[PDB]
Amino acid sequence: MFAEIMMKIEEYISKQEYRVIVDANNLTVEIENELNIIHKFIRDKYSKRFPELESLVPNALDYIRTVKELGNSLDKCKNNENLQQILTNATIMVVSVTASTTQGQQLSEEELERLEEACDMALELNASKHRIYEYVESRMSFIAPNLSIIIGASTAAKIMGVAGGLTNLSKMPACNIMLLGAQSVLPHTGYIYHSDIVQSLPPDLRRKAARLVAAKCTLAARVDSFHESTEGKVGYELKDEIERKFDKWQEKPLPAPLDGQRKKRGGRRYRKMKERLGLTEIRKQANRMSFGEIEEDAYQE
Amino acid sequence: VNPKAYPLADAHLTKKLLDLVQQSCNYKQLRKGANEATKTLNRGISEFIVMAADAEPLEIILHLPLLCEDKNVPYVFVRSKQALGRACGVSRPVIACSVTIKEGSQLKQQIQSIQQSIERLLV
Amino acid sequence: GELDMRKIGQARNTLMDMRLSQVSDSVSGQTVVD
Amino acid sequence: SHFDLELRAAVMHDILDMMPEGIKQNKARTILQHLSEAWRCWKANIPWKVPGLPTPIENMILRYVKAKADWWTNTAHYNRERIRRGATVDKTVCKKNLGRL
Amino acid sequence: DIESSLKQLAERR
Amino acid sequence: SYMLPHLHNGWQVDQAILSEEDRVVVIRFGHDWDPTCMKMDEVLYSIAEKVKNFAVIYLVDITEVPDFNKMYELYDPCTVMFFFRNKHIMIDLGTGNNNKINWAMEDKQEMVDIIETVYRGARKGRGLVVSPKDYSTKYRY
């Protein structure tokens, strides 16, 4: 499945319809899960040689590069030029402090060879996923430039794969666009909501801004259905309007010394306010003092 | 006007279409908005679908005659949404005002007459 | 190049949390309500 | 004791004398407002960013803000020391000192 | 306007 | 600073008193050199944009126009006096007289309240407005 998709992506990139981009996106989404499973297996296999390597490297690619650069030998963390290009200086210092006191035995030769093969397979899967994402971005820029510039190239490719192209997506209304590929399962979890354009928003204003993100992208489906808007100025204007709306959603005179003129109205016209808002209190048993006796204690207050 | 907006009605035809749209929206038989018109065309309950030629861009209503080619409904494009600028209380000019059949409509036959008049403009 | 002041603090906090969790992994009956 | 008002007056006089007669008709109030914004900015940890202002004007505003901040810090420390010792103050002075502290 | 008066006041103090 | 335009000419100041009638006219007879008049000007600037809709405050220099300090006898370094529609309202401060404030009021709220009370009294026509303050004492403790 992955080899035929890679051959189709190579044949598409060497020659430079719409289902090939969706197939490449599905192959990249499968290869990402395969690389995540390979990174989990490499972290479970290399846990004896470096048990603090998973805590020091939370990323899967960073942990794979650390397992490929250091491996069972913990002496590859002192002034290592290969580990300095993957992680930062503080991360390299934390990895050196973890490898100074690791309290773990080194792995065997077959386990290290299997870990190196899993790291090479994860690197090849990540490279194939990056090539498939680049091919999908090129096909989206050649097919739907406004939809790739407004909501993203991968989101436009997923919308064209789910709806059936730009010709079927143009028919889709804002409600369908808002819940494009939408559904505990989140109601109205549209692809726009599950996208990079909706990820740069607070969760309290993530869905409704997705209503500003999907339906305008539906206008991009009306923009890429014909042969017009090949540059992407409408998608850039929609993205600028969405950014202005997200910036707006996120973050003295003195009255004259005059009073009322006179009182002439009262009863079912001004009495309602004086009975509800300025409601009549007890007006008794709370204003009397009983100057002769003393009800409360001497210092109850 | 826009060349892609087809068909184009006359002045009295647009006045009668605006009167029928106001009579449908005042009797709860008209839906404004592009997504509401698309939902009324996909549901198969919309008697007529009207568009606006003064739309920027005009491609957003371009699926409104094509859905009219998918449900056998008459299509028409007001020169400007301004005709329905107030529409059913809409402050902004209205474009997609899917007029859906209303049970015992006080102007049901009048709406049918508008349909018959909108089917002869596209020739 | 540039100074990332928060980077060293984050690294130290992560190391301390990892060490404590390793110590906390030896606890006997710490409860958890899902 | 009156470092704030004196410094503000000196800065305003310097800016006005530097400013041309063609710009001193109405932009003096604008420069005063910019100085006020700079002062309120340093008192609330909010950066004062006027990219449309001349670099020497920004430098003068920053110098005035630094001088006023130093004077305010010294005055607040002195007032807090006097209050702790038991000096004679009023409600307005106490409120201002509490706010500055 | 106010610039002249401010300068005059400053020059005497 | 001193954004309040000082009426240099004495006759100009008098005409300014006769200029506005529906609001409060306050003239600061303090000389701008002294620090006390500087504090008074700062207090006025605090209420410059607040009491503007109800009052019109002008500065004054007793050296520029001496007739005000020789006829009204404003000998204080910075005395605040009021004149409403050619009628010098008196504020019942309780300092023996009521022609001037004579104190460097460093409280903006107190000045605003005094201005509001003076406006209310002028509207009521009371030549001696009862000041809602115990100005007879230092009001400090």
Folded structure, characterized:
This is part of a larger assembly, with chains A (301 residues), B (123 residues), C (34 residues), D (101 residues), E (13 residues) and F (141 residues). Chain B is of the alpha+beta class. Chain B has helices at residues 11-26, 34-43, 63-71, 108-118; strands at residues 30-32, 46-52, 75-78, 97-100. Chain B has a single domain (1-123), classed as Ribosomal protein L30/S12 (60s Ribosomal Protein L30, Chain: A, 2-Layer Sandwich), CATH 3.30.1330. Chain B is built from four helices and four strands; from the N terminus they run H-E-H-E-H-E-E-H. With 13 residues, chain E is mainly α. Chain E is built from one helix and no strands. The radius of gyration of chain E is 6 Å and the shape is rod-shaped. The relative contact order of chain E is 0.27. Chain F has 141 residues and is an alpha/beta fold. Chain F has a single domain (2-136), classed as Glutaredoxin (3-Layer(aba) Sandwich). The interface between D and F is medium-sized, with 14 and 12 residues. Chain E: This is Splicing factor 3A subunit 1. Chain E: It is found in: Nucleus; Nucleus speckle.
Helix/strand order of chain E = H
Radius of gyration of chain A: 33 Å
| Proportion of strand residues of chain A | under 5%
| Biggest sheet architecture of chain E | none
Cα shape of chain A: flat
Q: What overall form of chain E do the CA principal axes indicate? A: rod-shaped
Blueprint of the fold:
This is part of a larger assembly, with chains A (301 residues), B (123 residues), C (34 residues), D (101 residues), E (13 residues) and F (141 residues).
Chain B: H1 11-26, E1 30-32, H2 34-43, E2 46-52, H3 63-71, E3 75-78, E4 97-100, H4 108-118
Helix pairs in contact in B: 1-4, 2-3
Chain D: H1 3-18, H2 27-42, H3 55-85, H4 91-100
Helix pairs in contact in D: 1-2, 1-3, 2-3, 3-4
Chain F: H1 10-19, E1 24-28, H2 35-46, E2 55-59, H3 67-71, E3 80-83, E4 90-91, H4 108-124, E5 128-129
Parallel strand pairs in F: 1-2, 4-5
Antiparallel strand pairs in F: 1-3
